[PDB]
Design a protein around this ligand. Structure first.
Ligand SMILES: Nc1ncnc2c1ncn2[C@@H]1O[C@H](COP(=O)(O)OP(=O)(O)NP(=O)(O)O)[C@@H](O)[C@H]1O
Ligand SMILES: [Mg+2]
Length: 217
């Protein structure tokens, strides 16, 4: 409310370095922020999505300018700060959140897509997986494998995604975000259900990111 124009300036700087669905997504977030004008943003996932984009802006600011295809964003650092914010706000006693992120530099567009992705899925774990549970575990992993394949995992031991619900093909706004960003990353998403929990795995080709980013231009 005192940072409205500054927040908007940051989200615009992000917006003007990205494209396609991602750029659109940032555009929406910018508008919705101003409408509430604060705060205004905390009662739903808006605050969370703003924070993912601000944390990304901070990484860009530190990294300086470079070609859209240049690997300049430290993903592990960025995902760690997303995860920390989420467990701090949306966490709860008796719920353990482990975080294991590899050191890897990626392009801005790649980071933004993955960051929002992790925000969506991880929030989902803490918000939904433990409704009726007294204790739980969430694990976030980000592992570089062979052939520049990055695997991002979010694991619950909680309640499980309802069977009728075929997330992320079905769901609320979060599910639509996830499907778009996965597509923009050239990635593959998979989900595993049950009362033993929800396991989400996104396989991302970091080798193909340069190609994706330049095709958008
Ligand atoms: N880890 C999980 N464990 C249990 N249920 C889940 C989990 N993730 C998602 N769900 C369920 O799937 C639904 C769809 O989630 P989603 O598409 O992200 O929308 P949402 O989280 O409800 N609202 P939004 O803030 O926009 O994401 C949720 O409402 C939950 O009922
Ligand atoms: Mg959600």
């Amino acid at each position: 409310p005192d940072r409205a124009t500054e927040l908007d300036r940051q989200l615009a700087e992000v917006q003007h370095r990205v494209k396609n669905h991602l750029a659109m997504i940032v555009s929406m977030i910018r508008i919705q922020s101003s409408q509430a004008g604060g705060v205004g943003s905390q009662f739903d996932s808006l605050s969370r999505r703003v924070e993912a984009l601000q944390l990304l802006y901070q990484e860009m600011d530190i990294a300086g300018a470079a070609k859209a295809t240049d690997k300049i964003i430290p993903l592990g650092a960025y995902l760690g700060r997303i995860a920390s914010a989420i467990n701090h706000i949306d966490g709860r006693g008796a719920i353990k959140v482990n975080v294991q992120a590899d050191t890897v530099d990626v392009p801005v567009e790649t980071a933004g897509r993955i960051g929002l992705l992790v925000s969506e899925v991880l929030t989902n774990a803490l918000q939904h997986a433990f409704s009726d549970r007294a204790s739980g575990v969430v694990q976030l992993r980000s592992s570089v494998m062979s052939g520049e394949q990055l695997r991002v995992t979010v694991e619950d031991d909680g309640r499980g995604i309802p069977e009728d619900c075929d997330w992320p093909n079905e769901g609320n706004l979060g599910s639509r975000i996830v499907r778009q960003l996965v597509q923009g990353l050239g990635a593959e998403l998979n989900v595993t259900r049950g009362g033993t929990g929800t396991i989400v795995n996104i396989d991302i080709p970091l080798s193909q990111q340069k190609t994706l980013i330049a095709d958008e231009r």
